[PDB]
Amino acid sequence: RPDFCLEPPYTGPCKARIIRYFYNAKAGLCQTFVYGACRAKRNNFKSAEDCMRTCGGA
């Protein structure tokens, strides 16, 4: 499994408020978090299927 999914999400600066998905190593799967719409990282999937299809595998 990748390590960018174990890290926390990145709301980043900006002022937008989108509900992106990220892998919660504490939950074992993915959850939704506030995205800044800019400077997104690997811990910011548009859908839970993209987050699980990327780091999913527990």
Is 7 in a helix, a strand, or coil? coil
**Alpha helices in the chain, H assignment, sequence order:** 48-55
Q: Superfamily assignment of 1-58 in CATH?
A: Pancreatic trypsin inhibitor Kunitz domain (4.10.410.10)
d(CA 1, CA 21): 17
Q: How was this structure determined?
A: NMR
Tokens of 5: 């999914």
Which residues have a Cβ under 8 Å from the Cβ of 27 and sit 6 or more positions away? none
